Design a protein around this nucleic acid. Sequence first.
RNA 1: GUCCAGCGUCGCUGGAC
Lengths: 86, 86, 834, 86, 86, 155
Amino acid sequence: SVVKSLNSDQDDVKVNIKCLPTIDPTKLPRHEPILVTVTARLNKMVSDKLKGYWASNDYRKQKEQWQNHLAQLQRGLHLLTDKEYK
Amino acid sequence: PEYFSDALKLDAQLDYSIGGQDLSEIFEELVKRACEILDCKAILITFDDIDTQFDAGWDVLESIRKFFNSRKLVVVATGDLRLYSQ
Amino acid sequence: KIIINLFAPNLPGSTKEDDLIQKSLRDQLVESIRNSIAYNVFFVDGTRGAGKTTFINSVVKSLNSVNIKCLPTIDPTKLPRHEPILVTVTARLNKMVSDKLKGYWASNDYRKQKEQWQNHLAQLQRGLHLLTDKEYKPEYFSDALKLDAQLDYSIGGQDLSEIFEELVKRACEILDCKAILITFDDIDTQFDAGWDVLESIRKFFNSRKLVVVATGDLRLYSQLIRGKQYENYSKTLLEQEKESVRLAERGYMVEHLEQQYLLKLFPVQKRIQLKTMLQLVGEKGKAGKEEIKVKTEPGMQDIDAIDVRQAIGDAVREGLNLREGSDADMYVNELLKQPVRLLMQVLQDFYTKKYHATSLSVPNLLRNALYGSMLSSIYRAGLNYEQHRFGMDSLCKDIFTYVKQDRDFNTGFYLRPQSESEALRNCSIYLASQVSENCQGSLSKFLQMLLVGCGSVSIFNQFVTELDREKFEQLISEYVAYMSVGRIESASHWANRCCAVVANSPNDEKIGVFLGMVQLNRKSRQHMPGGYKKFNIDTENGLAKAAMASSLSTVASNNLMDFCSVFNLIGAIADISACRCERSAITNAFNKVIAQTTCIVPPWSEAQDDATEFSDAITKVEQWLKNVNEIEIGIRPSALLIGKVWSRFYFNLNNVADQHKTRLYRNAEHGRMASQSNAAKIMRFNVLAFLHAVLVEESLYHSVSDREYIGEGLRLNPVTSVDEFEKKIKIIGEKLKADNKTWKNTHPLFFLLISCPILHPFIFPVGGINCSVKALNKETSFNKLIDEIVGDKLLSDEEWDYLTKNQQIFQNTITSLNSSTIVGASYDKDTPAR
Amino acid sequence: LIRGKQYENYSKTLLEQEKESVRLAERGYMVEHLEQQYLLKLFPVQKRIQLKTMLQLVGEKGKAGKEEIKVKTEPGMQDIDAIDVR
Amino acid sequence: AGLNYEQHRFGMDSLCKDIFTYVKQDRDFNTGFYLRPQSESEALRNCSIYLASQVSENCQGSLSKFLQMLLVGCGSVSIFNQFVTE
Amino acid sequence: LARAENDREKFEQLISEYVAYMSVGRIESASHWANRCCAVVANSPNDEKIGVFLGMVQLNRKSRQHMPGGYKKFNIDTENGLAKAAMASSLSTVASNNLMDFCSVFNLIGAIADISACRCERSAITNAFNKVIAQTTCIVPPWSEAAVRAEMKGS
RNA sequence: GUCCAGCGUCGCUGGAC
Ligand SMILES: Nc1ncnc2c1ncn2[C@@H]1O[C@H](COP(=O)(O)OP(=O)(O)OP(=O)(O)O)[C@@H](O)[C@H]1O
């Protein structure tokens, strides 16, 4: 109920809340870090909104920068689940 | 981490609202397609008893909880509660 | 000057220079650090939530304003489970050097220092495999013997302890600082992570250019280091030698090794201790060396900030309905000893919910704060936890569990915080708040705890506990299931079952009088000495019959015993004064249990117009109820009050059942001598002991009042006579006359009880009156004073004169109760003459 | 979960040597103190919300509840002649 | 709660056990035949209401059906309490 | 009351109660200390059941019936000025089941301690001396067999 | 000095005259 009252705002005030889809730890596939699931669901909202732009110059600038941060995270994701240092 | 990039993938198939793999939704649309080919409202999955084992039941119980959730499936289990409760 | 507002995030990364608590300590340590470098490990310790992260963040910010450069603060908890500390420190040191290296201006210096620094950094990378290794691979022996002529390596081998020594020297030259400061954090979340930090400190960080500050608590490091010394013993030896003489000697070598290892790492003359809030603000009387004030509502300008101790008290005196005094100072002094993470946690919830509520039932705000804050302690105590079941049923069962785990029954039901276990010092203050809320602004609920909540504790401790820790728990599982502490129906039904338990224990010389009750004969005995006869219910006419037919009991033993209990009288008051609506309900409470319920023996038992009969009586209750419904709002009970009145009502009632047991002479009927005693005299004191108990404590511990009107004197108990009871009433009445204070407002609980129509017939029964020249002076004075307090004449002068000096029907006095005989008593003996 | 994970954070050998029933006294005490502080840090008390059943809103006799709930039983009555929830 | 959860096949004889099998679980034989929900468990406070509904339906509009349930179902909880103690 | 080797947790717990009741380590006045030690001495009356003790003798607060000699109640006011100054300091009261009076040399030692101070002045001595000659009551220790009845009656 | 009262199990304490 509070999700539908925050993702369906009338754009009344500048401060805004964007709600990710509900995450269920039980139904989530095991041996998968929560941080990975959150980023995957966060990607869909940003990627779909990136597709929704109208200014071609703005879309190309953000896509280059946003895709750069994801490539930085995956390099460090090895450090999250390891059994030894190297 | 080699499969992290695969989860963060945009698809033209149904434009999956939930990111990542999420095998629950992948199997869900498979049943919808099978109903169109078979021309039926729903498909029933019927399981037999586990009355001689205590490991066949656990995989049956877990699969029903996670995957077989759509309205196109009706499941008819079989057994006695004493084994399942234990 | 410290002002702590309650409307901020208050996180360690959200505090300003003014919100800091340990300002004096911070300035001492920072000065102390610079002394050591100019002319080597520090330590700041304290309990959990004492302000560890906040304090260490204050130090690092202050140093950035001899030059000492400080690395960003690190903690072992928020790190990879396998990453060595040396890698983490080096990586942060690289970032600081690189930024300063880009800030140079001379091309020659920057183009030369960078390779000199990079050469050292690349050398440490080669020897890193020596730390994360599993087994010595001998192919590195060849590469460990190529001793370079440069870098001036005094000792051969890899000697990684010296590679860091050279590295830090080069980094200090680039940054142009005399020393480098490293800050760690607490290992409270991750206990195991502290071992790697400790071992690295003693091995690598031994340079003169480094200073280290560590935060935690020595109570946890000791239990970690000592846990690591046992692995140094062979497993086979630990399992073979098991005799206690060797285990004791071995159990001391570990302890001594632990102290020496810790003492060589953190020097004692370097440690700093974080004082909790109690030591800063000081005591109530002895003003401390520093003061702390807080904000309460938004918009409060800094001038009118109240003291923290006063702020806690205003949430305790009003929250628990407890008068200001020594007891109030005890609760606040206990709350200060709590960790700062929890002290500031209750305040941010009570006051915030207070502002929005005001934009009341203040104890409802306090309970919701303490219950959430102390929540973990309730689960350990086994107490109740559910949210939509609060009420009478839970608290009566709830109060029995806390005393059960405290191993106390005498003072247990006072809900004092004077226990010894921490898990029970958090469930006492919360319980004191739970009762203060629930029995507030009502009289039916106030009498239920006094009869059930604070009563069931003492009954078990005196009549059932004299029957093996599994049997003691077996006994408890039966007493609860019989008395029905939970699943209770009514205070009247509780008294009937309580009558069976109290009557099970034997009495000396088989005399049928017990604690707060009298047993009357059911059959008739031939050749009765005197005018005694069988008790009959068809004697009293009106209110005398109503106020006495509601104080009976009936058990279902081999033969039925017909009891008569003052406890059953108390249940009728709380049952009647419950529903304000209708009028037929008053009739039901008089005859709801009398001839409908059978109470079987405990399982551990070793052995005229009918309408006008009560129409005058029923009305009297109705006009009395309107007085209750208009004044009961102003009463403010408390945990102390409902417990203290029960102590006086118990010991006083104990003496009555004992002293009046040897005075059953054959001249008891119509007896009015002091040494004489009968059923009427005994019960005249039981219901008067209850009234006396409420009067004494109300002037002592009650919120609505401001001080005590008893005055200096000795508080006694009317066990055999009533000489001093009105002496109290007369003395108190004088005080309110001088102070121009009305009687009803100052003592609301006493007023609604002394005016109760039900107790009026039992104040002056027939046999209870004493005839003597001195006794009549006190008895007459007693009658006069009660006339003024109630405002209605109890008994008329024409009727009164008959009772005192040797027919006539009565409507406000029991007539033939003294003539009734106690079963199990023989009246062969007569009254001694003296 | 938190209390259990605190016990798994001890040296196993120490838990077998020091069990003289007086050393164990501060073993249980120290775990609860660590566990209690852990819960407050994660979920502050002033950020907890509890659902309210309809009884604590309105229904108790003699008290004017802060809210009023109106229920209409017969089909198609007006929003003014409906009967109270109690 | 182990009562008779049958949708149909109802009668007075099946009701007698329901009264008796409920008081035994509540372990209160003095006031078991009142069916007033005063228990401390939520699983039983929701079954007394169902039982109190069946006694009204079965005994409404008859005399033999009234004496039989009182004599048999209601009395057995009291007589048995005279021989449990021994 | 409880030996050491019988219980090493009951013995230590007694020390925790003893320091709080006896106010050692947080003292405020030497005289108050001497008033407290009077009560703890009487907690174990000798088998002979006499009012004489280690350093104190218990006077009788209420006159008895038959005195074989010329004996009477104490009657504090009978003495003279200087005598009353010393005697009033000696006098002490302990709140028990029934009030009892005590006179111990410890109070005299405590009396000298409070008087002995620097910066002597006429007003300072007058107020301090008047504080020395005062009547104070001390509750029995919490470990006494009658630590609850003396709480009901009050001072 | 005397009467009344209360705590302990005779002793003990309060009040009045
Ligand atoms: N000086 C202070 N002024 C105001 N609030 C303070 C102060 N010190 C501590 N607090 C309060 O106490 C808590 C801070 O505790 P802190 O995080 O420092 O303790 P810790 O448990 O040792 O640290 P860590 O979070 O690293 O485990 C917060 O709730 C904060 O509001």
